Swiss-Prot record:
This is Annexin A2. The modification N6-acetyllysine is found at K18, K121, K196. The modification Phosphoserine is found at S153. The gene is ANXA2. Calcium-regulated membrane-binding protein whose affinity for calcium is greatly enhanced by anionic phospholipids. It binds two calcium ions with high affinity. May be involved in heat-stress response. Inhibits PCSK9-enhanced LDLR degradation, probably reduces PCSK9 protein levels via a translational mechanism but also competes with LDLR for binding with PCSK9. Binds to endosomes damaged by phagocytosis of particulate wear debris and participates in endosomal membrane stabilization, thereby limiting NLRP3 inflammasome activation. (Microbial infection) Binds M.pneumoniae CARDS toxin, probably serves as one receptor for this pathogen. When ANXA2 is down-regulated by siRNA, less toxin binds to human cells and less vacuolization (a symptom of M.pneumoniae infection) is seen.
Amino acid sequence: NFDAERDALNIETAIKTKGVDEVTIVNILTNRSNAQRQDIAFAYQRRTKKELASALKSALSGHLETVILGLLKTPAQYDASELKASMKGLGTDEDSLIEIICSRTNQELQEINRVYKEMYKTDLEKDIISDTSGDFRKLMVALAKGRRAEDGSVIDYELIDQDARDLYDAGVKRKGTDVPKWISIMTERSVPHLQKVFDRYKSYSPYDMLESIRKEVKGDLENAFLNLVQCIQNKPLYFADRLYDSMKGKGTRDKVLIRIMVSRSEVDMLKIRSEFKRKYGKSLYYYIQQDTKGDYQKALLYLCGGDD
Ligand SMILES: [Ca+2]
Ligand SMILES: [Ca+2]
Ligand SMILES: [Ca+2]
Ligand SMILES: [Ca+2]
Ligand SMILES: [Ca+2]
Ligand SMILES: [Ca+2]
Ligand SMILES: [Ca+2]
């Protein structure tokens, strides 16, 4: 039913339309898959002798442009560029770096690592190492390797218990914190395993994993661990809370809102929407409506997929 050549045509027309027909441009790209958008972009370049992304960059502006260009990139290219941007210039955008490095799976990170080097001619790890220091750097480096254990069929009950005690002994039960021990367990073990480990941890500790983290560390490192545990325990809820934070207050933290909507639209948006509505009483759709306007809002609402 999909027709790249045709979509590339309608978009060329929309762009040509006096004043630029954004509604049409949004209606198409926000209602197509990422793979389909890739075909449309190929069909386009052939018809115009110019890259689709490049054409939309000249034709669009503001937050809408940000949404659209992000959508034209493959998942790995998007993440790679968002990562680069988080480290660009002196200083670092810790939140963004953390959000991506903590939430992506091995398969995603492997591709990201590959695409990153091709795009920027340097390894993601090298840039991370240059932009970070201390335990925070250690954690971000280990997670970025994308070498976490795969979901096994056999539940390792003995390991689950030892990991829990180790986590407990490394923090709550000692002066200071054996951060390396925490980094090792939380980056190497499979997600299903760690979910069980965190439950077993509650059998030994009066405070769960998240609260333990708040008690033991601070700064970027504390932020990384909290984000990571959330992604392990309930990723869809993790994104729902970040979505809530980017819109709850004055204005909007557009960069966060956009990245999540673009990067999770084809992954688990349905679950994010469900967790969001359950926790906040109103739909994700509703919050986007109150915080954004114009073609930008319409674009985000399409990526949302519907109201709840
Ligand atoms: Ca217009
Ligand atoms: Ca522009
Ligand atoms: Ca930097
Ligand atoms: Ca900073
Ligand atoms: Ca301690
Ligand atoms: Ca703290
Ligand atoms: Ca707001």
